[PDB]
Amino acid sequence: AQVPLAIVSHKRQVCSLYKRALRNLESWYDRRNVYRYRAVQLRARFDENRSKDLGEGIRLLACGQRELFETRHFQPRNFANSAGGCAFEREVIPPDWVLDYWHPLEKAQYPEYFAKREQRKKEFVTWWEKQYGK
Amino acid sequence: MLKIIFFLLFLIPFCFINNMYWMVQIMMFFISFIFLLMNNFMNYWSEISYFLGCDMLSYGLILLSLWICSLMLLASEMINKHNNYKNLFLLNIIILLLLLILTFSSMSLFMFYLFFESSLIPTLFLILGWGYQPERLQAGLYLLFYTLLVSLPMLIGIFYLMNKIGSMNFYLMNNFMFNYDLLYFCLLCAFLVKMPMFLVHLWLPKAHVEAPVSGSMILAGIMLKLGGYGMLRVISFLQLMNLKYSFVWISISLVGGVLVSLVCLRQTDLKALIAYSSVAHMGIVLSGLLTMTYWGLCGSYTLMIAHGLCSSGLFCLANVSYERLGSRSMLINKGLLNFMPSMTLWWFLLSSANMAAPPTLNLLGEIYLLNSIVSWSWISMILLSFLSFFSAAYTLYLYSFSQHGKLFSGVYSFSSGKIREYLLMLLHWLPLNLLILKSESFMLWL
Amino acid sequence: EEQEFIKRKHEATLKLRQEFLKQSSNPYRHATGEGGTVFDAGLARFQAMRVSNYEHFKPTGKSFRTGLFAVVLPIALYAWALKAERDGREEKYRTGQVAYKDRQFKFI
Amino acid sequence: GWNKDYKPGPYPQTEKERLAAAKKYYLLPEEYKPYADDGLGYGDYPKLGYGLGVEAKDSYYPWDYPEHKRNQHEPISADHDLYSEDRWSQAEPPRYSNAYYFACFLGVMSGCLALYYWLDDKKMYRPVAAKQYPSPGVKHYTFE
Amino acid sequence: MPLTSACFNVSNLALCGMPFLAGFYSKDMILEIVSISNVNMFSFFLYY
Amino acid sequence: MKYLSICSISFVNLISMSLSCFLLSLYFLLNDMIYFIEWELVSLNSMSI
Amino acid sequence: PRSPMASFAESVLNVIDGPITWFRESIVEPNQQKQNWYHQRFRRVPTIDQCYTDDAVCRFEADQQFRRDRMVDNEIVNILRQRFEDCTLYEAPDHMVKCRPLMDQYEKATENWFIKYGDLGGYANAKTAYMKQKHRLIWERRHGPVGSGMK
Amino acid sequence: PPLSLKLINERVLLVLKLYDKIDPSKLNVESHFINDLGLDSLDHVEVIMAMEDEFGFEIPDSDAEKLLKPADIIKYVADKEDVYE
Amino acid sequence: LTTEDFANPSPKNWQSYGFDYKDQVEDRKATKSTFFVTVTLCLVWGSFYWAYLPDTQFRNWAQREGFLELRRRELAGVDLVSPNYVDPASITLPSDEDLGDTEIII
Amino acid sequence: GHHQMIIKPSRFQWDKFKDLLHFYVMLGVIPVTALVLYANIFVGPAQLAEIPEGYEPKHWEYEKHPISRFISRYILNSDQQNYEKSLHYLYEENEKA
Amino acid sequence: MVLGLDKRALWGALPLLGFAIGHFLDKKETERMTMFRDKSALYGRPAGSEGKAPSW
Amino acid sequence: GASETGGVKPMVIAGRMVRERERLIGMSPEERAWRKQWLKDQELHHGPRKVPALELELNNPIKRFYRAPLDKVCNVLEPVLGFQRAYTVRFWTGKALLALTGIYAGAYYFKYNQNDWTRKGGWRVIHSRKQCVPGDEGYPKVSDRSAPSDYAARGFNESPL
Amino acid sequence: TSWLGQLMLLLSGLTMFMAGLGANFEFDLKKIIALSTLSQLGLMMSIL
Amino acid sequence: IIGGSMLNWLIFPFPYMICLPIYMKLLTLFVCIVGGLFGYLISLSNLF
């Protein structure tokens, strides 16, 4: 696994700007018939000035950003089952060792699970030994 | 009361005999049961043994002392796990128990002061012999010398009283009244440090933080109350002088209350929250007490008792975390609802009692104290409202953040809830619900 | 982008990510079952500073003005107001202006 | 180690101490910036965070402890609370400034309140007669 | 959902005061009691 | 709460209790009674908690 | 029994009263021993006025008499309150019918109770109460009715 | 209901066949955005944005740049929803 | 361990009740003894003893007279609540010269 | 039925705790319930009445209930006991002072 | 002496011995008590009702 | 010896992949093996096996008895309506008996042990008078609370002395 | 019978109208319902 | 659905008598209806 660097290119500062704009259309226009109209009307506004000098790009951000911030829906279409959702992250689960501390009679309900649980545990130990040669 | 005293002395040998931690424990509870049976008192001094009496004010205080002193042994078992001189621990506890009984029953002021300040030692053993933090040293310095630096000076006031009075039985002082303007400060302030007062709260957070579960339970459960019990007995003759100079004390207590509550919000340690919280509640107790009105005093007696109980239970909770996750911090401790949900019930309940949710002998207090203060001065209401408001505020934060958020990633497998701790939490709370049925014994003492 | 400030932090700071994983997944000290947590410097730093900053406290004009207006003036003003109002009310009471009919809180 | 072992040092007063302290807190030499140490300062403790809010920090970044959006060894801000998502903090810049929020509320409240009291002076009604009550000595007259 | 849709109708109409449902029995009787009793301009206009 | 859903357990006693309350409400209406049962705890300075 | 449900509520009233009153007559009367319990009559005491300057036992006796008397008079205020309480509950229209005729007893009781015991606070014994009366008598004789300032 | 890996594949395929500005025939499932699809700087995020709305979650802003193929999109959806199995 | 080990655990191990981690019976007898002494002995019998305690503070007796004393004063025609600790005639006020402005209190 | 497990801490200790609580409390309650039912139904309440002028109740006469009768006479020192206690003790202390 | 109370109640007697000694001592205090035994000013019987009735 | 697990090996298996974000950003083929294995043995088919004496251990003798008079019904009534309906009949017989029993107890206690002028601190009761109706016995009814002594009677207007 | 009536009629009237407006613009279904609750409750407190 | 009816027939022994102007009693219906007009009109919007 790789954790990305935080450096950003003006292309990304401009394209993710287009992304947020599309979102801001949603939060201000809902009807998909209405939307695709205005979303493609937005595209022309991102297309008429497609390629400009860097300096103009900086002023273009100086206007673009304000438009989002000054025209942001007071209730953005925050996404349901993602971070910031209206019901996301409803519950959590603890690390498996909690299952390790079941009372032996508590253990005695799912022997097949616990047996396989025991096997996988030793095989994980081998895996972790590998993970950096211990 | 010599019945109790001789019982405790004949319990002392069990400390030497090996493997008597649990035998001692049952006996201490059993004698508490016996002391429960002995109950017929009125306002007058009763059960007048050679120099030991007992009364409404002393009877409940003793019961709490015997109660909490037995609950120590439930709280602390790591001493047995470690074999960390269990004999010295048990001997220290019993010695402390005897001193408390003799302090609360000393019918003489001087006998009272004698045992009162004799308790300086065994408590210091309890922190130092079983402390954890390196701060344990400087903490012991704070505890002992804040106390002695004012607790010694009342020794002059006591003897001055003798010379002008001829004795030190409590009824005898009540017959007289003194207004020399130093007697007042010398006795008052000397008790105020152990109360403690917001301006001399300083030591108390340190003592609680770097002390074991047992010592902290003792410190917040009796020592603060013992200071107050002396006040109730002594202010009888300080009235006129108190009336002239009282606005200062009530002001700093009330002002300090909202402040220390805001300290609690910003604080980030379980014992620190409870320690500051206990100072806050004892701020209101000091206020109603210094009102000296009937409502204030009879309510103060109740709030001391209830506050001691709730503070103990919260300390057992703090011990539980400290003994599982090995760190007092708010940050490390979190989401315990996922690991001990049946325990988080008790977390909520003890928190509930500390924010004065009924049926709760604590709550019964604030009705009495708040009535007294409001009558005494309407101006108080502007700060009484905020004082209780922020009281509940930090308790909410303590309960939520500790038990609610998503778990901590780095946490090494620790055993789950167990009968000792479960029974310990019920035992501190359930009597705190019981008493309301018969508050009259815990509510009327004047 | 500073020319690799983000990168320069990147190299070292991503190393201890793996050591955190090694610690967390550590089958051995998790097997000991004694509780406790993987050490974390920020936590240890934070506790120590939280408990001790007096050795840093310099009693200057800032701290004095800060503390003065923090509690002192609050304590003094509130206490003075309380004493002043009580002095007036008690003055009426000892003058006997209000008889045993009008007065309130007859029962504390 | 224990807290006294970890006690932060005094504020660094020459560049070498700045290099040392930044390493003490794992910070880069510019990342490290001690407090003003003017009379109520922690000294060498770095001054981090204090931004608009913790939840402004990356939502999806790989976090060792997502709970506080925190990676491993890293100097916790002296005011971690008072900026935590559980406490005073937001995710995005506010739309307006403080006066706006208070003004928009309270200015309306004052005006509508005062205009009500003006209109209470003229309390309308249905033009009906006073409610009649039987009683000794009362002799309202029937329209007959 | 024709059941949930229909039920959500019943809640709307009870809350909307469509005649001889909950709102009509309650919202009505209040509003003319406002008329009967002498009241203030805003309080009157604001209810409606 | 070991063999039957807790929802069942509370539901049935709840419907049973409130129907009893409802019918008692009628009794109160047809007679216009107002009971004020009281159980005192303590009393000091002439007040009665 | 005009009304239907009231003609039914009676039926459950017969249901509820049935077993209990049967139980009272069935397993109480054949199982009860007769015994008597009386009510104190504490002798009067030489009050603080009587006792000497330093007669600690006598002073202690006086205070206990004062406390018990306080507890009763403390009470007589409560009973009058309970009595007024019933009247205000008597009938929905019936408030002014007997409020003042009945309450004013409670009003006088409060003021008298205040004068004797009020304004002393806890710890108050017979001495401070008794001398307060002395002070009030002096004030009444010198400055006139309390509630007039001074001359 | 659970989610089936094959159906995730056909579903991203359905939207891809649906999207006009892509090469209409939807050339090889592993069509890189800048190579044969020709997806411009902005057309790339239009792809991601539809995928979002279709699959009920935002893709992270930089992590879209990790998504450089319809195979990636399946691979990112699979990591989310436990689709390997 | 394997399937049958988990399915039917042996009677060797024992789950400590938090009191003693060495002997099964010592732990169980401690918990058994501790539970009895604490719960039944105080929180049943003791609660029972209080709940049936006799008049200790004489509150009930105080409200014995409360009915009588009030009733005694109401047919007696004397003040129900006399505002004098003793008879205002029994007291003997000293003369104004004795007073000499001894800060008389209301 | 199609059960998919859930990671849950142990409930055994908590369940045992409730069971011990229910067990011992009923243990104490049963003889207590027996005792209270006995006295009240086998004997019941002494009836209030006047003084017979020639009589003098002993302190146990002044409590209505029998369990009070048993407690006060046998277990608690009389108020008159704890009254003279003080009168003695205050006599010495006043004299000594 | 069921082996669940072995040596435990046996030592536990001594605390009960303390209560017995404590009881007897305080009862003797009730002996030095007697100065007003029936000679008070509130409960004090004037003369008669003795009848071998040393109230407390 | 002593333990809590009986000797189970206190570790955790999952690894980096516990976090939804972590699994979702990058995760190796060996990690795909474990995670699939983890979510593969997540399933369960048979059910919570029964431990006979576990119920006994968590059921004290005092509880055992009063289960019997109503549980003994189940063993015979179970086949008639099945276990689910049989227990349902058991339970509501138990609760119905409890409720009706308490009702008479409470009605008794308000009939014979009210808070009168002797005992105090109990449930003192007080009421208002019924609503007359034209055509009723003593329709134009007079006030019964003749004198203030009537108010706050608490049994004292019916004193034995 | 005192100015508390005037003060409450101010507030209850205002909030029901403030809620009666905010409900239109709010999009979180449960939130709109809650606003209707306040809008209705304000009426109750005003008639009272 | 039955709603207030059961209460309305069993709560008011003295139903409040309200004989108001027709332009007031009916006004409660149309000032009510214009809201629904706006609620279902302002929502219904043509694209451009």
From TrEMBL, chain C:
InterPro entries in alphabetical order: NADH_UbQ_OxRdtase_NDUFB4_su
GO BP, sorted A to Z: mitochondrial electron transport, NADH to ubiquinone
Keyword Ion transport: no
Similarity comment: Belongs to the complex I NDUFB4 subunit family.
TM region(s), chain numbering: 64-82
Organism: Drosophila melanogaster
Protein name: NADH dehydrogenase [ubiquinone] 1 beta subcomplex subunit 4
Superkingdom of the organism of origin: Eukaryota
Gene behind this protein: ND-B15
Upper taxonomic lineage: Eukaryota, Metazoa, Ecdysozoa, Arthropoda, Hexapoda
Key words, A-Z: Electron transport, Membrane, Mitochondrion, Mitochondrion inner membrane, Oxidoreductase, Respiratory chain, Transmembrane, Transmembrane helix, Transport
UniProt-recorded Gene Ontology molecular function terms: oxidoreductase activity
Topology of the protein relative to the lipid bilayer: Single-pass membrane protein
Subcellular location: Mitochondrion inner membrane
GO cellular component, as recorded: mitochondrial inner membrane; mitochondrion; respiratory chain complex I
UniProtKB/TrEMBL annotation, chain I:
Cellular localisation: Mitochondrion inner membrane
GO BP annotations listed: mitochondrial electron transport, NADH to ubiquinone; respiratory electron transport chain
GO terms for cellular component: mitochondrial inner membrane; respiratory chain complex I
Keyword annotations: Electron transport, Membrane, Mitochondrion, Mitochondrion inner membrane, Respiratory chain, Transit peptide, Transmembrane, Transmembrane helix, Transport
Presence of keyword Isomerase: no
Topological category with respect to the lipid bilayer: Single-pass membrane protein
Segments passing through the bilayer: 34-52
Lineage top rank: taxon: Eukaryota
Its job: Accessory subunit of the mitochondrial membrane respiratory chain NADH dehydrogenase (Complex I), that is believed not to be involved in catalysis. Complex I functions in the transfer of electrons from NADH to the respiratory chain. The immediate electron acceptor for the enzyme is believed to be ubiquinone.
Quaternary context: Complex I is composed of 45 different subunits. Interacts with BCAP31.
Family the entry assigns: Belongs to the complex I NDUFB11 subunit family.
Protein name per UniProt: NADH dehydrogenase [ubiquinone] 1 beta subcomplex subunit 11, mitochondrial
Phylogenetic lineage: Eukaryota, Metazoa, Ecdysozoa, Arthropoda, Hexapoda
Name of the gene this protein is made from: NP15.6
From TrEMBL, chain J:
Residues spanning the membrane: 21-43
GO biological process per UniProt: mitochondrial electron transport, NADH to ubiquinone
Keywords from the UniProt entry: Electron transport, Membrane, Mitochondrion, Mitochondrion inner membrane, Respiratory chain, Transit peptide, Transmembrane, Transmembrane helix, Transport
Keyword Transmembrane belongs to the record: yes
A cellular component term, taken from the record's GO annotations: mitochondrial inner membrane
Subcellular location: Mitochondrion inner membrane
Membrane-related topology note: Single-pass membrane protein
Principal location class: mitochondrion
Family that this chain belongs to: Belongs to the complex I NDUFB5 subunit family.
Oligomer and partners: Complex I is composed of 45 different subunits.
Task of the protein: Accessory subunit of the mitochondrial membrane respiratory chain NADH dehydrogenase (Complex I), that is believed not to be involved in catalysis. Complex I functions in the transfer of electrons from NADH to the respiratory chain. The immediate electron acceptor for the enzyme is believed to be ubiquinone.
Name of the featured protein: NADH dehydrogenase [ubiquinone] 1 beta subcomplex subunit 5, mitochondrial
Organism: Drosophila melanogaster (Fruit fly)
TrEMBL record, chain L:
Region Disordered: start-end pairs: 134-161
Segment forming the signal sequence: none
Listed Pfam families: NDUF_B6
Protein name in UniProt: GM23292p
One GO CC term on file: mitochondrial inner membrane
Top-rank lineage group of the source organism: Eukaryota
Transmembrane intervals: none
GO biological process: mitochondrial electron transport, NADH to ubiquinone
Source organism of the structure: Drosophila melanogaster (Fruit fly)
